[PDB]
Design a protein around this ligand. Sequence first.
Ligand SMILES: Cc1cc2nc3c(=O)[nH]c(=O)nc-3n(C[C@H](O)[C@H](O)[C@H](O)COP(=O)(O)OP(=O)(O)OC[C@H]3O[C@@H](n4cnc5c(N)ncnc54)[C@H](O)[C@@H]3O)c2cc1C
Ligand SMILES: Cc1cc2nc3c(=O)[nH]c(=O)nc-3n(C[C@H](O)[C@H](O)[C@H](O)COP(=O)(O)OP(=O)(O)OC[C@H]3O[C@@H](n4cnc5c(N)ncnc54)[C@H](O)[C@@H]3O)c2cc1C
Ligand SMILES: NC(=O)c1ccc[n+]([C@@H]2O[C@H](COP(=O)([O-])OP(=O)(O)OC[C@H]3O[C@@H](n4cnc5c(N)ncnc54)[C@H](OP(=O)(O)O)[C@@H]3O)[C@@H](O)[C@H]2O)c1
Ligand SMILES: NC(=O)c1ccc[n+]([C@@H]2O[C@H](COP(=O)([O-])OP(=O)(O)OC[C@H]3O[C@@H](n4cnc5c(N)ncnc54)[C@H](OP(=O)(O)O)[C@@H]3O)[C@@H](O)[C@H]2O)c1
Lengths: 445, 445
Amino acid sequence: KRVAVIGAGPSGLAQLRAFQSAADQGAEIPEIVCFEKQANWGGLWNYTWRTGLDENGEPVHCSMYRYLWSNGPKEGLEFADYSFEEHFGKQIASYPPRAVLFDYIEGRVHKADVRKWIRFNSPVRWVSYDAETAKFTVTAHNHETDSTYSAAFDHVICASGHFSTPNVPFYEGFDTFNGRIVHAHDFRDAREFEGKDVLVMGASYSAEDIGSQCWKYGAKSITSCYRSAPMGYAWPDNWEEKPALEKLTGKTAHFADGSTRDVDAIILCTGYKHFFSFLPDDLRLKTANRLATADLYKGVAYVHNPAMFYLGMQDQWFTFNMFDAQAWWVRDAILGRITLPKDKAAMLADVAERETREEASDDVKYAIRYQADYVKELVAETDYPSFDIDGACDAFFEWKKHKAKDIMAFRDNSYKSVITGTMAPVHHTPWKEALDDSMEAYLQN
Amino acid sequence: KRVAVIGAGPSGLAQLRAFQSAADQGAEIPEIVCFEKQANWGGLWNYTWRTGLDENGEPVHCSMYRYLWSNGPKEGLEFADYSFEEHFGKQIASYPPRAVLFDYIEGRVHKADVRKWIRFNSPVRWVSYDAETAKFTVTAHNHETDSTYSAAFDHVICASGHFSTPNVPFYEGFDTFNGRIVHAHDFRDAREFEGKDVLVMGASYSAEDIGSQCWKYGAKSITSCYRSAPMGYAWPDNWEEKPALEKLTGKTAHFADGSTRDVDAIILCTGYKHFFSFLPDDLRLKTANRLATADLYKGVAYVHNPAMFYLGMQDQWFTFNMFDAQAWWVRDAILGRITLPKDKAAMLADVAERETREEASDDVKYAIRYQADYVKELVAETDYPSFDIDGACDAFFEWKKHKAKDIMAFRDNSYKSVITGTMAPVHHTPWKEALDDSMEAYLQN
Ligand SMILES: Cc1cc2nc3c(=O)[nH]c(=O)nc-3n(C[C@H](O)[C@H](O)[C@H](O)COP(=O)(O)OP(=O)(O)OC[C@H]3O[C@@H](n4cnc5c(N)ncnc54)[C@H](O)[C@@H]3O)c2cc1C
Ligand SMILES: Cc1cc2nc3c(=O)[nH]c(=O)nc-3n(C[C@H](O)[C@H](O)[C@H](O)COP(=O)(O)OP(=O)(O)OC[C@H]3O[C@@H](n4cnc5c(N)ncnc54)[C@H](O)[C@@H]3O)c2cc1C
Ligand SMILES: NC(=O)c1ccc[n+]([C@@H]2O[C@H](COP(=O)([O-])OP(=O)(O)OC[C@H]3O[C@@H](n4cnc5c(N)ncnc54)[C@H](OP(=O)(O)O)[C@@H]3O)[C@@H](O)[C@H]2O)c1
Ligand SMILES: NC(=O)c1ccc[n+]([C@@H]2O[C@H](COP(=O)([O-])OP(=O)(O)OC[C@H]3O[C@@H](n4cnc5c(N)ncnc54)[C@H](OP(=O)(O)O)[C@@H]3O)[C@@H](O)[C@H]2O)c1
């Protein structure tokens, strides 16, 4: 067999690691080719100063910015087969900067000798499936040689992410506003906004954190705005939450309650689309961003062609070790170890069950536990280690409590690794004062 | 016969008009489908506040910005078959704002009844060619219905532009700079830079004009930097021209002559790439931006597959009337009124002749006349009516002298129409004071 993996972010890398681990235990594995658009692996964790289009003219994948740190407890994303202690030679604090988690992600696969399977600077242009040959044809462009070519595969595993194509709504006045307007995707350096009055549109992670970076790096004020309900945290005194934006007139933002605030810049933290520029209708996943992803049997096998799989397409509480659970499962399906239902109706019913169960309660603890149950389900079916998933849940619950206590100080907390049991040490510098985001500053005294 | 046109900017619109004109005169024409990525026609002239990726997730085509006006004399682009005075019912000044030129472009195509052939929100994903069937297969994605489809064609005419995929060179310090760094392609509102010291990198039209907008809308200072040769105009007191950038250290820019200065913002006016994300090796034009475009017989027929054509791929002195000449020629080749050489070597020799002749002199007037000669060559070979091309050259020559005299005031000049023979009136407001860019303001009596 031959298998194509699209993407070398955490999910695609997990897929490579999964196959290699099976080979380490004596199993025959397919030939694997991984196509990656960027010049290096790491996916969203691979920072670039560039925005919009990259050095090759392709859409910039990176949505991360300077000064970004882990926004959940690292203990919730630890690889079960490669602990933080194994990688770093010691335990570290619970919310590491981007560069530190990048180092961890790449350490696992560097040691696994899977880089040689990856073709970098090679965006996939198209995938088609031919029922006669039972092959997928992947067409890719190699930017190193400026040559487009194609190759045939028995399986395609799409791990191309869903937090890179921005959702960018228009509001009245956006086109006549005379200040900076930027989506979270293209945000890079919070220092740009020092001394400024910023409008942050949105009510989730990007709004929380981009507003917080603006705060930390000296913005004059933050006005965030929500649609349905406020974020409701204990914000600093130069941060105000407003209900829905109605319009901009000059510098003046008008909100649903009739209030106004003058602002210098607008940052749209309005989320992302699932978007695949390189897929035909019969292979192209269409879904909302949620815990039960449409049209994915077991959350991974495409119901309209289950020789195609997708990784990481769920909305995320769990991240790295969920992608691992998925990758090990997909590997085992491809190796013939796990049976796929032959009846499409059964695959559709699996998804329907997942959707109904996700919807049964709107409680946040219920949501976290729902995804934990998904990880448990997948891990039970393969030889990925059976780890303390409930303890990961405990870390997420404590994190939630810390955020509610003090949204600006939640990163100044420690949790126990569920892999090695070690309570994270206290970091040497409180988050607000830790202006240097380098791995070297973080890991050294 | 079936023909696909990719793009509904000035070139694609010219192509539709060429076919409709032939039909109006009683000729049988092919079935025509025009695919356009944006929601409306006009190409670069269709303004959007959006940058990077559009509402559909596609690369934003627009490179135009607030306050943009015609940068050459309108008399030099005035449509051979449709005067400004006719469209507006009166004479107007010689450098109309974007909105005014868009209205003019639209007027002509509305009259032509060609919109029926255009599919908007429908980027082309791919074109392939089968030599056995002599058919192109065009795959396009309809963003309104979220459905990709394909269709077969005898010819493909690519009019997708070459001033939209930015050339974005890395210089030391760009990744660490504390300030806005933006390519011309993503520049929208000069007012963002009021009170700032702006660095403008480049020495062509974008550098001239974006620096000028920043000046007009209140930047504290402009520093422009060139690498090859200086623009060398008579700059205003707060504009300095420097040689090549060596690096930034913090906010300090260091130049090739050993000089330094601190800057708050950087605008990269470093040009664009010919880039086609949707073409395989056998169809994909590769060329520098120049008057003699590589691999294009008669500047339009792809030498490696002469059933494929390209419009507007040349660097531009002439624009609209050249695209018309090209469109009429391509139409005639497709209708069989013009016969292409059956010998590839002859086609390659045509391109080599054009390249050698372009290179024979580096004189600006020589370049302008070189492209005028090209327009004349094409017009002589079709039923496109000859017009006073030499008079248009005279307008460009006067424009060149006006820019050399006063770069900040060149738009405060008039030229004689080569279509109506009338000298353009003086505008009601000097360019520096004309802050309102609306069509209504411009046309006020
Ligand atoms: C701003 C931001 C901050 C985040 N912070 C955290 C955090 O602190 N903790 C956490 O656990 N999670 C975080 N996440 C979640 C993130 O989803 C996961 O951490 C993880 O990166 C998802 O991995 P992935 O491999 O599924 O997708 P991605 O990381 O998006 O990688 C997908 C890969 O596919 C490649 N690709 C895309 N299109 C093509 C193509 N046509 N051809 C070839 N290759 C292609 C991309 O270049 C990329 O390498 C964050 C997400 C964002 C957007
Ligand atoms: C900033 C700027 C200012 C300018 N100012 C002037 C001026 O004052 N005077 C002047 O004479 N000229 C000016 N020009 C020159 C400009 O090149 C021409 O005026 C003209 O717009 C070129 O026409 P075009 O149709 O060849 O290309 P474009 O105007 O670039 O249009 C190409 C079209 O192709 C579409 N397209 C691209 N890719 C795809 C795809 N995959 N599928 C479907 N559709 C696609 C685009 O959306 C667009 O509609 C300017 C150019 C720029 C960049
Ligand atoms: N490590 C970090 O610090 C960090 C920083 C940024 C992001 N991340 C990650 O990035 C991923 C995505 O987070 P995200 O916050 O960008 O996306 P998200 O969780 O999908 O949230 C989207 C937000 O946009 C809002 N929204 C959507 N359309 C809107 C509109 N037309 N008008 C106003 N609001 C609109 C939503 O509000 P409604 O509920 O009203 O629809 C919602 O608040 C997550 O994994 C997150 O953890 C991490
Ligand atoms: N109507 C208007 O007011 C207006 C405004 C803007 C643009 N436009 C239009 O846009 C089109 C393109 O104009 P343009 O000026 O953007 O592009 P251009 O004419 O192609 O010029 C590109 C410029 O970038 C420079 N450059 C390229 N690579 C560089 C690098 N690595 N470092 C430094 N400099 C670099 C080039 O310098 P070298 O010569 O040294 O290579 C050149 O000066 C034209 O049609 C123009 O008329 C119109």
